[PDB]
Amino acid sequence: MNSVTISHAPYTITYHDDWEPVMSQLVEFYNEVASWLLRDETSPIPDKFFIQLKQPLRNKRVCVCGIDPYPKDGTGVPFESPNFTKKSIKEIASSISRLTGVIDYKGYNLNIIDGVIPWNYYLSCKLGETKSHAIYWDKISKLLLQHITKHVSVLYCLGKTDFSNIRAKLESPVTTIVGYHPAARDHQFEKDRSFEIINVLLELDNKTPINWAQGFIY
Amino acid sequence: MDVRCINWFESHGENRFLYLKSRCRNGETVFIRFPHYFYYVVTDEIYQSLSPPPFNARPMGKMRTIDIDETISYNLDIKDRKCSVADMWLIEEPKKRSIQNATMDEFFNISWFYISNGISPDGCYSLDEQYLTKINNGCYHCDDPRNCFAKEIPRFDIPRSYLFLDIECHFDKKFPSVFINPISHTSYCYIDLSGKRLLFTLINEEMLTEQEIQEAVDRGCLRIQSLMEMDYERELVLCSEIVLLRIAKQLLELTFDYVVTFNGHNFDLRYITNRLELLTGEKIIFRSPDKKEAVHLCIYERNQSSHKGVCGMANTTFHVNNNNGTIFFDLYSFIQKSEKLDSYKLDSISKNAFSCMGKVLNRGVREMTFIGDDTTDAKGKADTFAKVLTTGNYVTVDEDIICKVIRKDILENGFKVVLSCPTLPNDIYKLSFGKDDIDLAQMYKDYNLNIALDMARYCIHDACLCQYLWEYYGVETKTDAGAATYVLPQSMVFEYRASTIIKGPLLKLLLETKTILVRSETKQKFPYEGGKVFAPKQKMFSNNVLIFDYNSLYPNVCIFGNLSPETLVGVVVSTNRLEEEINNQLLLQKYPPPRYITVHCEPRLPNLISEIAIFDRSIEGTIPRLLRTFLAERARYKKMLKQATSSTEKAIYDSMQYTYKIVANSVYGLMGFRNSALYSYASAKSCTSIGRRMILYLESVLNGAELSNGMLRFANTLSNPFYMDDRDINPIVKTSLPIDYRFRFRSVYGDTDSVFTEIDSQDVDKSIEIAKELERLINSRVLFNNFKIEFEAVYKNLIMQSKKKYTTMKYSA
Amino acid sequence: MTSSADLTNLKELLSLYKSLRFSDSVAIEKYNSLVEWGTSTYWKIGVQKVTNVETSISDYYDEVKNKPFNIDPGYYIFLPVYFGSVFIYSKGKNMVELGSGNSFQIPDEIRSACNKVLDSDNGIDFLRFVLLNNRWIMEDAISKYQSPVNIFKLASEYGLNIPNYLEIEIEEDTLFDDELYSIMERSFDDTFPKISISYIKLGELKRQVVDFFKFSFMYIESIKVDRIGDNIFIPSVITKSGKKILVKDVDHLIRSKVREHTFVKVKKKNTFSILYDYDGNGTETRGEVIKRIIDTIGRDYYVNGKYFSKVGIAGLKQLTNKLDINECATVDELVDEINKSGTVKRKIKNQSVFDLSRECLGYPEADFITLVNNMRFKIENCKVVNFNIENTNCLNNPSIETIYGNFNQFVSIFNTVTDVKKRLFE
């Protein structure tokens, strides 16, 4: 556990030693963009921006990347807000509950999973519209993805429209599984029937397949 | 209505549309809309077996399909290559489809749009008013572009509206940041449709104190607060950053023919748009001429990390998305990718662009004047250097003497410049117009009015440098010629690669010859090596060396040998010597040298020792026809240029011949590209083998010969390495040369297309005369069919250190 | 993708990733291609080189026992394991050899019986082949769907020799001593020698091998040649102790690297003989061994396969011998006989004259073409007339020397076959 202090609203940053090599860089990359970012109300609080940076990365081998946090109700963990009303958590639960064979789903809580971490291309957004702060972390979205892809062997992303140029965005040709958004990639509903592909690909790398029922809460 | 085209572009919306930008004689810009299409080719049965009714069907006509799959054979029982003849049709579909047996999947859809409709990208057309439908003022829609372009007229010069802009932004680190640093100055050279070339620099007044702003206003600067107060006839205009960025946005929203900048895509436009979004939350709204769609300034990178050779990797090219039809031209990428330089910096290009030999009038300790009249210089460079010097203030005397111009004046066929340079003994010096060399941070720490004006002058000089390079390289004329030849959009003439460059003329040739090449099996690539430079006989030479080269060696050998994949009868491979000789004795009676030709290629497989490619020279192939047509067209345009007097026609013809030269000197390189439509392993191997054979023949005929009593006796007889000819074979030849001449020829070095021959003669004039006589003899008797050579220069004291590494003195003809 | 590959890998990539038992020479191309363009199968990115793999069937055998031990009680199927060449086969698979990649195809009837048996039950992973004395004898039947005895009886129903089978139930810790080995050997008594006796428990994939050594050194004699004219024999080695030495192939003889008529000790058995395999040290040139074996077998003989047929009596009879037709002595009669046999006529045309002649004389595909390469020819009417060598670097081994000596007979056969082809295809 390490703590760092900055000159802006977030101040303390929550992260782990696994993310440590880039954190300082992120700090400077957040020094010159926080002034023009905190001026507009955001879905998470400034402290909540760095929340998903503390989970361990060595144990996890598959990373699931989403499109963007929804404009309100910031929580710091993608597709995590338990309400059974918003499409995000319901889709992130039903994309694996039906495949595994379990029913009566109310939330999966990917935080406790030691092999799969949820992710988003953009850290946050503005209260009222999406992708309203993409410029301020356009290179943070590069360095975070570079750091996470160096700790895992399989990368999963949702939505081809916003993830078409991931290969150009990546430097090391690490294996990257491409998938569609559970709600709608582009005016098209996706059931996300590619999790068994992720399991078999992880098995091919001499690694145990992901148990998608370890954190199923019912 | 007469329209000359400027650019072609297509929309990126859900309902994709293609647009054409042109201008009339008066200067009114005309935009025309066409429906974007997807082009596919089908046969008779496939067209007749389409359950949905086709949107539009056009009979492509009779065409012959040939399989280009290599069939390696170990004996002379080689089956005939697959070939068929059938009627084909072309179909246009707005949306993407997946149709089986639809060939020609490599040619771009824009190339099909250009070629099927018979439209030249840079042509001037007298459109018909009956087939044109008007949308609104300046923007029309056409449903039948085939009938729209039914008339073409000879080209006429139009004053193109240009924007040559440069932007100097504040910076404390190596590269300025959008979120940290503001825009300081923006210099624009704006050429209207009326020809008024207005130079104006907008400055950010928020970095100057109120007294400084008042003093600048007293000095002539205009201070404004709103966009309605902007005046374009004043060089120095002071305004706030919000006002400056709004003015820049309203300028970039204008329908300019060419917005030309140096490294603008990477730095200038990106910084402008990002600062506009950050400071005010506004976006540069690019609007389509139809006023049906709008976008923002997005810069996307096309990355090409592939060389297919031994060198390193190239760079990526940035492009701006828009629908206003304005070419956001970047000269940096064009210069980098079309010219070799030691350093890819603006200073180097500026230094190597304009040079002038001038005479020192006075010395005055550190006060020298360099008069640049035509007496001390060449012809033509005087006016151009005067135009460059009008907007410049720094001179690179000698090679590193940076000096600042004190006074400026203009003289007829010359110029007047005075510099602070130390006294020198020599009278004539070569001055190169280098970029300004200043320590920006040190002089920015004490920023004031004079420093602001100096930066404004530097910015306007940088902005006008774009116009100077645009005129020097003939980029308008070269771009029009490249659009006409390569069959590509004017913005995509330089942006696209060699494969797309060829795909236009290659498709045109294929349509002319009704030829389709189809490859079914997956292609396999093998190292074909390629090279002949060997160890020189000697490295020390105190005598002159004569240089002789081949004029378009590879195109000519492809034409002569008919080195085409669809003409290749077959390949015979040998593993044992007995079957090799049996096959040789069979092919010398089945494939006679007088009609066919056999080329000894390198074995494609490790087990094989000898591979023989048999080319039938009865039907000319697509590659030889391409090269022959390109050479003929270049020669025709060159001989038309030689009789031209007007500068405009001179530039036009030079650009057209340059484009033909470029498109001719690419087919050999593209024969080694797997994904290209000219891919052929056997043809490339045969081409390099024939080149090596020609180099060997030239070396043999030029080594061991002697000149005595006007008679030349070659060491080896005039024997054709390929087949048997019917002409004189005696190496002894007579020349009209002095009897006292006693010289010996001994070649020591030979490149892929050049051979170095040493001559013991020391006189320059005698060496030049001997080289000319040798060239005439080689072109008259030694060579045959359609082969020629040329004389470039004479090398003196040629000493070789290693392969392709020599030091010598070159004397012009 | 769900359509194909990846999660299925077509059941080749996933198997070859970890299982090295099924590593035949046919699948190397597919595996190398799939791994090389792993970024081009459907999607994703991946590159690696998996070239030069070999059949590692030994994973099915845990370890080999050289001393008596204690066997666990249970139900055991006892079979005799013979000595000779080892092969694998699985549902029309190419007949590949372990360690050399030999592709000597089995006859049609045995292949038909094997594929019919495998179609009867799909649980048979693979079956071993033995080529002792140029004969095909069943070795093992690894399967889990049904007992190996049913597979053996089904194979024997078609008319194929199968090894004897026994079933033993033991409910105590019986010691596996030499008496048990002797009685099991007596139970599987046959004219065909066997190298050991194997026991299989409940069809376990992993298996144990038990054997003993009884080597002795008395004397060694010259290598006998069993050339009888039927092209079915082996280069047996005769000793002075009253027993011969079993040799599976000439490759084993040339790999033994043991001197002749000297103090030689080789692996003897209780009632059989196993040729010694060179695994120690010592100084011995290959050329001397090749000469001392070629002079014993014969000057006109050489080293390849198991035939090394004579050349001096070739004439036209060897053409009939290699075409399994009746004897003949005249060109026109031989041509008519070839035309009469439709299968022979069809199978002649797909092979070149040079290849047919080199198979008729049995010229190896290792050095014959190499010697032909570095030598000049003068050819008239597509028949060899003159030949001359220029370098002796390829003449170091006696095999090239004797091939050059018989090159006259080779040219005669080449001319004869060329004339036959010309008269048959004109």
CATH number, position B230:
3.30.420.10
Residue A129's contacts (CB-CB under 8 Å, 6 or more residues apart) are A71
Give ∠ CA B412-B416-B418 in degrees, rounded to 5.
Answer: 180
Residue B262, classed as helix, strand or coil, is coil
Question: Three-state secondary structure along chain C?
Answer: CCCCCCCCHHHCHHHHHHCCCCCCCCHHHHHHHHHHCCCCCCCCCCCCCCCCCCCCHHHHEEEEECCCEECCCEEEEEEEEECCCEECCCCCCCCCECCCCCCCCCCHHHHHHHHHHHHHCCCEEEEEEECHHHCCEEEEEEECCCCHHHHHHHHHHHCCCCCCCEEEEECCCCEECHHHHHHHHHHCCCCCCEEEEEEEECCCCCEEEECCCCCECCCEEEECCCCCCCCCCCCCEEECCCCEEECCCHHHHHHHCCCCCCCCCEEECCCCEECCCCCCCCCCCHHHHHHHHHHHHCCCCCCCCCCCCCCCCCCCHHHHHHCCCCCCCCHHHHHHHHHHCHHHHHHHHCCCHHHHHHHHCCCCCCCHHHHHHCEEEEEECCEEEEEEECCCHHHCCHHHHHHHHCHHHHHHHHHHHHHHHHHHCC
Q: B151 and B258 share a domain?
A: no
Give ∠ CA C69-C72-C75 in degrees, rounded to 5.
Answer: 130
Long-range interactions of C392-397: CB distance < 8 A, separation 24+: C394/C367, C394/C370, C396/C287, C397/C286, C397/C287, C397/C290, C397/C367
Give A126's DSSP letter: B
Q: At what angle do helices B622-641 and B647-664 cross, to 10 degrees?
A: 160
Let me know: does B8 contact B121? Beta carbons within 8 Å.
yes
Give A17's DSSP letter: G
Q: B139 and B201 share a domain?
A: no
Q: N- to C-terminal Cα distance for chain B?
A: 51
Does B216 reside within a domain?
yes
Does B290 reside within a domain?
yes
Q: B6 and B132 share a domain?
A: yes
Residue B807's contacts (CB-CB under 8 Å, 6 or more residues apart) are B797, B798, B799, B801
Residue B554 token pair: 């590879």
CA atoms in the 13 A half-sphere facing the CB of B121: 28
- Dump the DSSP string for B419-472: E-----S-SEEEEE-PPP---HHHHHTT--HHHHHHHHHHHHHHHHHHHHHHHH
Residue A161's contacts (CB-CB under 8 Å, 6 or more residues apart) are A185, A186
Residue C150 token pair: 């049913």
- Dump the DSSP string for B705-750: -EEETTEEE-SS----SSS---S----EEE-S--TT-EEEEEEEEE
Residue type, C1: M
Q: Test C352 with B75 for CB contact under 8 angstroms.
A: yes
Query: From the CA atom positions of chain C, what is the Rg in Å?
Result: 25
Match 């109700």 to its residue by tokens.
A73
Q: Return d(Cα C143, Cα C120) in angstroms, integer.
A: 12
**Residue B53's domain spans which residues?**
2-60+79-158
Let me know: does B17 contact B33? Beta carbons within 8 Å.
yes
Let me know: does A61 contact A203? Beta carbons within 8 Å.
no
Q: Return d(Cα B466, Cα B261) in angstroms, integer.
A: 6
Q: Return d(Cα C267, Cα C257) in angstroms, integer.
A: 14
Residue C52: which of C78, C79, C27, C81 has the closest Cα? C27
Residue B740's contacts (CB-CB under 8 Å, 6 or more residues apart) are none
Residue B558: which of B503, B480, B615 has the closest Cα? B615
- Cβ-Cβ contacts under 8 Å, A197 against chain C: 1-2, 6-7
**What's the structural domain count of chain B?**
4
Does B331 reside within a domain?
yes
Residue B337's contacts (CB-CB under 8 Å, 6 or more residues apart) are B314, B494
For B83, the enclosing helix (H) or strand (E) is strand B83-93
Q: At what angle do helices C398-405 and C407-424 cross, to 10 degrees?
A: 50
Produce one character per residue of B334-369: b if its CB has 16 or more CB atoms within 10 Å, e if not.
Answer: bbbeeeeeeeeebeebbbebbebebebeeeeeeebb
Match 């850290």 to its residue by tokens.
A123
Q: Return d(Cα C225, Cα C236) in angstroms, integer.
A: 7
Let me know: does B125 contact B151? Beta carbons within 8 Å.
yes
Instruction: Pick the last residue of a domain from B158, B191, B210.
Output: B158
Instruction: Pick the last residue of a domain from B91, B125, B158.
Output: B158
Residue A139 token pair: 């290179």
Q: B284 and B311 share a domain?
A: yes
Ordered structural domains, chain C, with CATH: 9-54 (no CATH), 58-210 (3.30.470), 220-297 (no CATH), 317-424 (no CATH)
Q: B20 and B96 share a domain?
A: yes
Q: Return d(Cα C290, Cα C278) in angstroms, integer.
A: 15
Let me know: does B320 contact B265? Beta carbons within 8 Å.
yes
Does B602 reside within a domain?
no
Residue type, B56: N
Instruction: Spell out which chain A residues touch chain C, with contact meaning CB-CB distance below 8 angstroms.
Output: 167, 173-178, 193, 196-197, 200-201, 204
Q: Does B75 touch chain C (CB under 8 A)?
A: yes
Let me know: does C45 contact A174? Beta carbons within 8 Å.
yes
Does B677 reside within a domain?
no
Nearest-CA distance from A33 to chain B in Å? 7
Q: B238 and B205 share a domain?
A: yes
Instruction: Spell out which chain C residues touch chain A, with contact meaning CB-CB distance below 8 angstroms.
Output: 1-2, 6-7, 9, 14, 17, 39, 43-46
Q: B462 and B412 share a domain?
A: no
Does B490 reside within a domain?
no
Q: Test A33 with B177 for CB contact under 8 angstroms.
A: no
Instruction: Pick the last residue of a domain from B102, B135, B158.
Output: B158
Q: B19 and B114 share a domain?
A: yes
* Chains contacting A (3+ CB pairs below 8 angstroms): B, C
Q: Does B585 touch chain C (CB under 8 A)?
A: yes
Q: Test C1 with A197 for CB contact under 8 angstroms.
A: yes
- Cβ-Cβ contacts under 8 Å, C354 against chain B: 576, 578-579
Residue B637 token pair: 């345009």
Residue A71 token pair: 């404009």
Residue B4's contacts (CB-CB under 8 Å, 6 or more residues apart) are B22, B23, B24, B124, B155, B156, B158
Comparing CB atoms, the residue among A174, A176, A200 nearest residue C7 is A200
**Strand pairing partners for B286?**
B295
State the method.
cryo-EM
Binding residues of B for Ca(2+): 166, 168, 462, 549-550, 753
Number of CB atoms found within 10 A of residue C310's CB: 17
Q: Return d(Cα B642, Cα A168) in angstroms, integer.
A: 49
Does B497 reside within a domain?
no
Q: B137 and B14 share a domain?
A: yes
Give ∠ CA A131-A135-A138 in degrees, rounded to 5.
Answer: 100
Q: B304 and B364 share a domain?
A: no
Q: Return d(Cα A187, Cα A179) in angstroms, integer.
A: 15
- Dump the DSSP string for B104-172: --SS-HHHHHHHHTT--TT-EEE--SSS-EEEETTEEE-S-HHHHT--B---------EEEEEEEE--S
Name the CATH topology of A57-204.
Answer: Uracil-DNA Glycosylase, subunit E (3.40.470)
Q: Return d(Cα B678, Cα B671) in angstroms, integer.
A: 5
**Strand pairing partners for B65?**
B84, B516
Residue type, A135: I
Residue B20, classed as helix, strand or coil, is strand
Q: B103 and B227 share a domain?
A: no
Binding residues of B for dCTP: 552-554
What's the gap between Cα A65 and its chain centre? 5
| Active site members of A | 68
Binding residues of B: 166, 168, 462, 549-550, 552-554, 753
How is chain A split into domains, by residue range?
57-204
- Cβ-Cβ contacts under 8 Å, C39 against chain A: 173
Nearest-CA distance from A174 to chain C in Å? 7
Nearest-CA distance from A194 to chain C in Å? 8
Produce one character per residue of B384-401: b if its CB has 16 or more CB atoms within 10 Å, e if not.
Answer: ebbbbbebbbbbbbeeeb
Q: Return d(Cα B370, Cα B403) in angstroms, integer.
A: 12
Number of CB atoms found within 10 A of residue A25's CB: 13
Q: B149 and B253 share a domain?
A: no
- Which candidate in A32, A40, A139 is best for mutational testing of the B interface (most B CBs within 10 A)? A32
CATH number assigned to the domain comprising residue B426: 2.40.30
